[PDB]
Amino acid sequence: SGLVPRGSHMVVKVGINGFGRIGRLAFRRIQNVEGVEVTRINDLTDPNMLAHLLKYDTTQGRFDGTVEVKEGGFEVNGQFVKVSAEREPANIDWATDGVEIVLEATGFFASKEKAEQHIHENGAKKVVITAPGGNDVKTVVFNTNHDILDGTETVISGASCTTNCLAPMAKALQDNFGVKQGLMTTIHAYTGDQMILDGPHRGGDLRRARAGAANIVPNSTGAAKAIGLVIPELNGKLDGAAQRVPVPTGSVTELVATLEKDVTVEEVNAAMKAAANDSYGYTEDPIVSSDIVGISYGSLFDATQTKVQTVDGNTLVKVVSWYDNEMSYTSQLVRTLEYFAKIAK
Amino acid sequence: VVKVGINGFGRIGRLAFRRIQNVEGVEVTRINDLTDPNMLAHLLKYDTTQGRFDGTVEVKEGGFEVNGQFVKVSAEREPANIDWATDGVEIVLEATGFFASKEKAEQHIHENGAKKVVITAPGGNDVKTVVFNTNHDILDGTETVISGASCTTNCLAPMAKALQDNFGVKQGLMTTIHAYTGDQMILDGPHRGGDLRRARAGAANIVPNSTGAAKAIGLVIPELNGKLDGAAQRVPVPTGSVTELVATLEKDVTVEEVNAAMKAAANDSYGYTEDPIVSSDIVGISYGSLFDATQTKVQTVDGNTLVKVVSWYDNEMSYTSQLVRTLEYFAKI
Amino acid sequence: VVKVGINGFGRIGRLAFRRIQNVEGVEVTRINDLTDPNMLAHLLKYDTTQGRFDGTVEVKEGGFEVNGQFVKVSAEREPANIDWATDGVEIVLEATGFFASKEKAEQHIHENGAKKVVITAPGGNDVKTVVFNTNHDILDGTETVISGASCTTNCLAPMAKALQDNFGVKQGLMTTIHAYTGDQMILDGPHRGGDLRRARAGAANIVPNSTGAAKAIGLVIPELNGKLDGAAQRVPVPTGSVTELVATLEKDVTVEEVNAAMKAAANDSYGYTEDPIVSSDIVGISYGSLFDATQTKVQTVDGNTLVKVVSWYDNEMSYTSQLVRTLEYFAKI
Amino acid sequence: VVKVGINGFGRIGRLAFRRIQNVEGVEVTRINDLTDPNMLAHLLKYDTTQGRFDGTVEVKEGGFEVNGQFVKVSAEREPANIDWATDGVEIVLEATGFFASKEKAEQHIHENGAKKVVITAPGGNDVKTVVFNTNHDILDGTETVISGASCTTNCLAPMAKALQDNFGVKQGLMTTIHAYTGDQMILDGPHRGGDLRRARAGAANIVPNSTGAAKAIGLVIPELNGKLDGAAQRVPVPTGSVTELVATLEKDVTVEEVNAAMKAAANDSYGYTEDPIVSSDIVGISYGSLFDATQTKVQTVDGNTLVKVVSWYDNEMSYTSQLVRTLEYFAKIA
Ligand SMILES: NC(=O)c1ccc[n+]([C@@H]2O[C@H](COP(=O)([O-])OP(=O)(O)OC[C@H]3O[C@@H](n4cnc5c(N)ncnc54)[C@H](O)[C@@H]3O)[C@@H](O)[C@H]2O)c1
Ligand SMILES: NC(=O)c1ccc[n+]([C@@H]2O[C@H](COP(=O)([O-])OP(=O)(O)OC[C@H]3O[C@@H](n4cnc5c(N)ncnc54)[C@H](O)[C@@H]3O)[C@@H](O)[C@H]2O)c1
Ligand SMILES: NC(=O)c1ccc[n+]([C@@H]2O[C@H](COP(=O)([O-])OP(=O)(O)OC[C@H]3O[C@@H](n4cnc5c(N)ncnc54)[C@H](O)[C@@H]3O)[C@@H](O)[C@H]2O)c1
Ligand SMILES: NC(=O)c1ccc[n+]([C@@H]2O[C@H](COP(=O)([O-])OP(=O)(O)OC[C@H]3O[C@@H](n4cnc5c(N)ncnc54)[C@H](O)[C@@H]3O)[C@@H](O)[C@H]2O)c1
Ligand SMILES: [Mg+2]
Ligand SMILES: [Mg+2]
Ligand SMILES: [Mg+2]
Ligand SMILES: [Mg+2]
């Protein structure tokens, strides 16, 4: 390569738009990254609300450090972070606080055209969307395809929680055995786009309208359909859907697939274990969803759930991987942000 | 047959619609919310806590049919711009949660508008606040805006009134252990009202919060003005609540006398039970308040007594039943 | 009028009793469990997920009255020691979960005992396994012990049969997203069956677990023997479940053709819907299985196709409705 | 370094084990339950509400290794038959819930048995009942069987003691809004103890139930004997609870005086906060009781005052922290 990455001693200043579940957890992880520092947060509320929500967290625990509210922001372990309440990305003066890269984590500007509103005079230089960002934006799952970045990009995508879970599992199947086709079901924690109790859903979804913590709720997901953005050779081969269920975080992805090469359960499991790294984990323990809350793997393969069914010479393969849709995704997002910040030019 | 409109087809609005189906002399001809007819029709048909709709619902142009009868749906954000009179609407159920004052609710009353408004919530001290079968006799029919009180007030009032009439209340403190509601966040996030506790995941926490029901009880029971205060603990059930009152009394009492007084005060609004029930057993009940004799305490220490009385309520259907009883009576006069 | 005995007045036993109140030719005259009549009467009257009993229940000496009719209650731990014949009982619903085999269920059949038994669960390969309206024609009336199968089998069977009859099934894999059940721990603790996942808090986790419904489908639909396998993900709802099947077929299909085949297969046991429902909408239904056309997929890649079909079931009431249909039919022949 | 045994490797037993890993003078060499080592090792490693175990756990013949150190596991149903002395065990944490009395807990003490027992629950009126940093001074070290009280008692005691010492309590009523526990049914079914409310689905209901914490407060704070009574509302959180006390006092007070008195009473056992927290924020805390100044009320009507004071507790880890403090102290002076 010729990427001439900055050292982690060269601290890149970052902005967060949307201090929500992903925004706040990203902020937490950035405290333990040497070369990245958050100097500006933009949301729709006062500093006290945001400071309180950083300090206390229902699913991810108390903040590791001190948080203290101040005029126009709050201090985190002594260091001041500016807070603003600007509804339009175009009006945020990111350059005032030295911000080069924005984490776009509101859920309202997840496209090239909308995210580009952050890039203007007195604005930011680059934007990382914390969600799928359309087919014209480079979409990175860290340790699967982050080598597609050269640092000249203005808008990139960190993909979805489900994509970060599925990608290394699907890639391992492809590289070892060849994937012909497959169908995915993710059994997913409820999220902030569902209603706490039955009521009109602003996006017109009749199922997200329903009480999220009291129902099994079917819903759509693009993670299988858009896997070609991450793994080109799987383009058009996967499709899927979700069943959202009453846990506040923690999810699992099942993939049923046909393969080119013949396999046994043992060979499938061995292939996953050999593909394991900081992003893709491996376990043979019979765990449940609470055991993956707060993990740093993007995807945790569960060898206890593997199936290989051969009937009349035709085989279906089932592979299953866990993910904390909050912290698993956030860990991948911050790995990508850190890498992008180093090569940004 | 008085024609009614519903502003805010939410939990209270939809359940009020359901109950109005079995009340002759009241009929809903117009619904106003912020969404399309297909969304509202689906939410009427299917209900997580209150069950499937008893009847047929079918989406049409600009509304939906309920058992063959068309109801118009509009999506007007401002009360002033709703043409209620077009559909014959005299009385409006103001059930959005955003216009719970005399000035704001009066916006429904204009040319091509409505005549009267019932606020499905506390509406201030200058609006008559009615708990049915406790103080609905204060209505004369000339009022423009009235309040149906809160869910907690409809629970508390008959229980507090029975203690006052029989034994006299000196003072008391109330705790309501309450179902989570739509004003809490599904997961931890910024609360638009500035509440740091309603900001938290409502179905995953015991969440302390404020309530005005005990402090404002004087609007319903004048003789208890200034005598009660309280608070709430919101907990992970999607509907169904309970109110505890700890009080000092003028007269000496026993557990049996307290329970007997409640039984004697029982009616369509105020129920009585000695069964050891739990919250799921009161989901969908028609009582505004269900006294539970199994939870009564009378503690006497060194001549001084504290009395504990407890009543169940479905914050949804118990309140809605009361609301529709008041609507029916108000429309008649 | 055939007289029925219930062993194990649990979730299935109590709901079977409830359904039998609306079946004219059948009557429960004896209940056996491990507790006193007051506990059982209370648990009949009040039900967290299925609502208040539609009737009166009053505790008496050695049992309870349901709408004035006495039902005898015993607490006999061993099936061989229950004197079923005393109360005219000919057929026993074996619903404890502890006697789900031919040899164990046969203990009910003795002198002063019952004549026949229906196990409310899988009961082994030497017991006829019946899903009503899929294979109840295998019964001739001479059987002593039969099986009503599982909840998942009653969901999966009509959906799989419809695929087979119309298109021909080659193979398939099943996932059921299932309500937690009484065999899971309320909080993390030692599981008596040795299951490390059922040991975990059932209402606070997604819990993978095994199921035999797909593997044993050959007992119900012979032509699908050895063709299906599956597993479960148990999740935090107290009742209500859904079965997804991904399959390969002999004929080429479209989404529209698959949905049309299910609609044509629909009967009292197998329902059809195009409404975008969620799990609470199927609690208390009478269908054994409710096909959801909104979740169908037909994926064709390089000439090869996978088909996904999904059906809802209330693991409690859907199963119980099938069980009582089979019980009635088995009693009449 | 005193060697300890655990009878009942349940919620309290397992969390007690976890805390003992960070106590220098105490060490667990024997666990007794009703299951195989693989089940117990798995339940130690993975915990729904309290998180993954900080350390390595590996199953072996007849037990498991924790960071390379072997701990013996047995499955003896009767306390009389457990040979505690074989593994050097002097003090036993009795955490099954089935032997919470002097007579039943004494069964552990025999030849080849243990010397002393700490019951992780109320143990009756004839056993010394200790809330650490409230009345652990009543121990002299000669006792055979002691009690660590209940979760609610450990919450209530320092709050009630602070009111008594500063202002004087006449009487009071307590409501604890409590997490569901292992003695409730997961779904509606026959309750073996005959309780018609604990028979109901614990994670789907508000469930009224009895508690003895207020009535038996005299065992911990003698001067409050016969002055308090209460009850519980069990609700759908898997751990985390809160205790409300409404009381009449001898002295007149303000909200500020009441809060200041609690802050002055604060220590490792009794915490103080002014932050508007919720139950998830107290899961895993080491305070036995955490006073919440945001919920205090002082209502005066016609010269007569009622005072409301509220404290949080993680019925699991708050109680366990107090239990291990008392165990450590009791072992030191034995
Ligand atoms: N939660 C997950 O599991 C998860 C996983 C991966 C990706 N994501 C994606 O991350 C994004 C955020 O998800 P979340 O769960 O954190 O949502 P959230 O609702 O918790 O956070 C959204 C935040 O954005 C703020 N906001 C909304 N509109 C704004 C505006 N115009 N300007 C500034 N701030 C605004 C809100 O006040 C809130 O704090 C979405 O794109 C989502 O799809 C979420
Ligand atoms: N839910 C309860 O337990 C309960 C009990 C008693 C009283 N209340 C009161 O009833 C009211 C409604 O509560 P809810 O739980 O039904 O709330 P909800 O959120 O379920 O219903 C609110 C409805 O109003 C609509 N709406 C919002 N703004 C609007 C506008 N400008 N114009 C038109 N429609 C608009 C929303 O789309 C929604 O359908 C509140 O005042 C509440 O305090 C609720
Ligand atoms: N709940 C479901 O979703 C469901 C669905 C289909 C099939 N089943 C099957 O039905 C059976 C019962 O399941 P459930 O959910 O009703 O369980 P449950 O625990 O609710 O009911 C079991 C009942 O049997 C009683 N019992 C136990 N041992 C007994 C004995 N020796 N003698 C008499 N009574 C005894 C218990 O006291 C209890 O009342 C099981 O075989 C289960 O697999 C359950
Ligand atoms: N859980 C709480 O919130 C809490 C709080 C304070 C005190 N306590 C007390 O702690 C005790 C245990 O409560 P828990 O919640 O940990 O219960 P639990 O059900 O989680 O633990 C009980 C354990 O004891 C084992 N056991 C049962 N009978 C046994 C026997 N005869 N011999 C050996 N082991 C046996 C069981 O297998 C199980 O592992 C009770 O006395 C309870 O009142 C509990
Ligand atoms: Mg940093
Ligand atoms: Mg009518
Ligand atoms: Mg009948
Ligand atoms: Mg130690």
CSV table of C-alpha atoms and ligand atoms in Angstrom, one decimal, chain C residues 7-13 32-34 76-77 95-99 120-121 149-151 178 181 315-316 319, chain D residues 188 190, ligand 3:
chain,number,residue,atom,x,y,z
C,7,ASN,CA,-53.9,-35.8,35.2
C,8,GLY,CA,-51.8,-32.6,35.7
C,9,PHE,CA,-53.9,-29.5,36.0
C,10,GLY,CA,-51.1,-27.3,34.5
C,11,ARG,CA,-51.2,-25.0,31.6
C,12,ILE,CA,-52.5,-27.6,29.1
C,13,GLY,CA,-54.7,-29.3,31.7
C,32,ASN,CA,-55.6,-35.2,39.8
C,33,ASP,CA,-52.5,-33.1,40.6
C,34,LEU,CA,-50.1,-32.6,43.7
C,76,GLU,CA,-52.2,-38.9,44.0
C,77,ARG,CA,-48.5,-38.9,42.9
C,95,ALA,CA,-50.8,-33.7,31.0
C,96,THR,CA,-48.2,-33.8,33.9
C,97,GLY,CA,-45.2,-34.1,31.6
C,98,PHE,CA,-43.8,-37.0,33.7
C,99,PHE,CA,-45.7,-40.1,32.1
C,120,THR,CA,-50.5,-34.2,25.8
C,121,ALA,CA,-47.0,-34.6,24.3
C,149,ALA,CA,-48.0,-34.6,19.6
C,150,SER,CA,-46.3,-31.3,20.5
C,151,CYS,CA,-47.3,-27.6,20.0
C,178,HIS,CA,-41.0,-19.9,20.9
C,181,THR,CA,-42.4,-22.5,29.1
C,315,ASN,CA,-48.3,-23.0,22.0
C,316,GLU,CA,-50.9,-23.0,24.8
C,319,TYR,CA,-52.2,-26.9,20.9
D,188,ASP,CA,-48.9,-19.8,36.4
D,190,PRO,CA,-49.2,-24.9,41.6
E,3,LIG,N1,-47.2,-25.4,27.6
E,3,LIG,C1,-47.0,-25.6,26.3
E,3,LIG,O1,-46.8,-24.8,25.5
E,3,LIG,C2,-47.2,-27.1,25.9
E,3,LIG,C3,-47.6,-27.3,24.6
E,3,LIG,C4,-47.8,-28.6,24.1
E,3,LIG,C5,-47.5,-29.7,25.0
E,3,LIG,N2,-47.1,-29.4,26.3
E,3,LIG,C6,-46.9,-30.6,27.1
E,3,LIG,O2,-47.9,-30.7,28.1
E,3,LIG,C7,-47.4,-31.3,29.3
E,3,LIG,C8,-47.7,-30.3,30.4
E,3,LIG,O3,-47.0,-29.1,30.1
E,3,LIG,P1,-47.5,-27.8,30.9
E,3,LIG,O4,-46.9,-26.6,30.2
E,3,LIG,O5,-48.9,-27.8,31.1
E,3,LIG,O6,-46.7,-28.0,32.3
E,3,LIG,P2,-47.1,-27.5,33.8
E,3,LIG,O7,-45.8,-27.6,34.6
E,3,LIG,O8,-47.8,-26.2,33.7
E,3,LIG,O9,-48.1,-28.6,34.3
E,3,LIG,C9,-47.7,-29.8,34.9
E,3,LIG,C10,-48.7,-30.1,36.0
E,3,LIG,O10,-48.5,-31.5,36.4
E,3,LIG,C11,-48.6,-31.6,37.8
E,3,LIG,N3,-47.9,-32.8,38.2
E,3,LIG,C12,-46.5,-33.0,38.2
E,3,LIG,N4,-46.2,-34.3,38.5
E,3,LIG,C13,-47.4,-34.9,38.8
E,3,LIG,C14,-47.7,-36.2,39.2
E,3,LIG,N5,-46.8,-37.1,39.5
E,3,LIG,N6,-49.0,-36.5,39.4
E,3,LIG,C15,-49.9,-35.5,39.2
E,3,LIG,N7,-49.7,-34.3,38.8
E,3,LIG,C16,-48.4,-34.0,38.6
E,3,LIG,C17,-47.9,-30.3,38.3
E,3,LIG,O11,-48.3,-30.0,39.6
E,3,LIG,C18,-48.5,-29.3,37.3
E,3,LIG,O12,-49.8,-28.8,37.7
E,3,LIG,C19,-45.9,-31.6,29.0
E,3,LIG,O13,-45.8,-32.9,28.6
E,3,LIG,C20,-45.6,-30.6,27.9
E,3,LIG,O14,-44.5,-31.0,27.1
E,3,LIG,C21,-47.0,-28.2,26.7
